[PDB]
C-alpha cells in the first residue's frame, strides 16, 4: 500500500525539470504518474524543486488548509511549478489537460509518516 | 509506558471477533481490557473490523472533532461496532455495562506515531 | 540536517540542571546552544526537565497554540523552567541576556517524526 507521503511524490513531485516542456507536458505527466488510471484527476500541480526543498516547507509558515485543518504550510520562496486542469471537452478514459506553468508560493498539507488512530469521536 | 497508538488498540480494537456474541460482552471487555482498573470508563466502543481497516480511516473523510482539533476522520463505509455504555447502578469497585451491537460510520482521531515536542508555545 | 525534534531539544531542553545555575546561565546557554550563531534570538525558554517528562506533554491538555494551531498541549504539572530575554542593551555580536527562573505550566506544540507532505492544496 503506497503512503500518503509516497503518493504525494508520485503525484506533485517533478525534480529533474526546471518548467514544464511543452503544452503537452501536463498530457504526458498526468498519464504517466497514473493520475487517469481511472478516472481524470481535475487538476493537480508538479513542483519542479528538489524533494527537499518540498519537504522544508513543512517547517516554514502554517497556514489553514482550504478544508480548515490547520496542518497546511506556505513556502517562504516562490517555486517552480506546473498546474494540470483538465480541459472542457476531457472525459474517461480521454483525459485532456491544460498545461500552465507559474512560480509561486506553494502550500502543502503536512503529517506525520505514518499517522495512526489514537482515540475514538464517536460513531454516526 | 504505553503509546497512544497501543492504548487506541487496546480500548477500541476487536478484531478476533464479527460483533458481540452476547449481552455481556461489554461487562467482559471492559474488564479484559482494562478499562475498569481506574475507575468505570462511562462510555467506550469496539470496532469488530481489521486493523488496517481502521487505520485507512485517517486517510479517509475529513470532519470536526468535538474537541476542536483538526485531526478527525470518518470512515467512507459502516463498521461493525459494540458501544458499551455504564449502566444507571454502575460504580466502582462494580462497573456494569450495556451492550449495544450496531452499524456506523466510525470518527476516529489520528496522530503521527511517534508524536513530539517541536516548538515551546508558552509557559503559563 | 537536524530534526525538528532535534532543534526543540537543542533551544529548549536542559535536562542536566533543576533550574537556572547563575544568572549569567542565559548568556551562557544561548551561547552554547547556537541561539546566537547569526543573530541574537529575542526570548527563548529552556526547560529543567527530563526529556521523557517533556514528550509526556503531548499527550496531555490540548490548548490552542498562539498561531491558532490546533496540535499544542498544556502540562498537567508545572515545570523548573527560565526564560531568557534580551536585554535592551544587547546587539550582536554580543548578545545579553536577562536569566528569570519560574515554575509554570509548559504548552508545547507537537507533530510525528518524520513529519511530510501529503497534500499539494494550492499556490499563492
Avoid at 503512503?3 to 525534480?15: G, I, L, V
Avoid at 478514459?93 to 495512526?116: D, F, R, S
Amino acid at each position: 500500500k503506497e503512503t500518503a507521503a509516497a503518493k504525494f511524490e508520485r503525484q506533485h513531485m517533478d525534480s529533474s525539470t526546471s518548467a514544464a516542456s511543452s503544452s503537452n507536458y501536463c498530457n504526458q505527466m498526468m498519464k504517466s504518474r497514473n493520475l487517469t488510471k481511472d478516472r481524470c484527476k481535475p487538476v493537480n500541480t508538479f513542483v519542479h524543486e528538489s524533494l527537499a526543498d518540498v519537504q522544508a516547507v513543512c517547517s516554514q509558515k502554517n497556514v489553514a488548509c482550504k478544508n480548515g485543518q490547520t496542518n497546511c504550510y506556505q513556502s517562504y520562496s516562490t517555486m517552480s511549478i506546473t498546474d494540470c486542469r483538465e480541459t472542457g471537452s476531457s472525459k474517461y478514459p480521454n483525459c485532456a489537460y491544460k498545461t500552465t506553468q507559474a512560480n509561486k508560493h506553494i502550500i502543502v498539507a503536512c503529517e506525520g509518516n505514518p499517522y495512526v488512530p489514537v482515540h475514538f469521536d464517536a460513531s454516526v
